Amino acid sequence: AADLAGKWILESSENFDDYMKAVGVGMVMRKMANAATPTQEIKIDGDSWSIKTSTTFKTTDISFTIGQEFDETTGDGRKIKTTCKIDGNAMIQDQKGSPDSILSREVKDGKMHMILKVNDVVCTRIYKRVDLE
């Protein structure tokens, strides 16, 4: 999963609105989030990670150690317990709360595929790399 490092910008999205409805995001915030073109900046040092997700209206920042449970507050404001692990090509962010959700990221054919799963909803968001320097 080491190649997730760098900067990424959203290229395509499928079923994000239903994902947000399932986790309880309100109407106005869904309007903003659906229209957004977020960037993700991912840094990796050994088993230490950070991920900054930026939009014009909201930024989230998390930092963690692979395998170590930590407190996360999501962009929409849910308090959850998160554990991240590496599974070959993918880094999986397993979120416990109300509701639970699974977020996976992996690079394929040069693009970061982020799959978000909650209850019976699956959302796929594909990011293109932004070259740094």
Ligand SMILES: CCCCCC/C=C\CCCCCCCC(=O)O
């Ligand atoms: C900075 C990101 C905040 C986006 C607005 C908050 C609304 C919904 C958040 C749902 C959980 C996080 C989804 C992340 C999707 C993605 O990174 O493309």
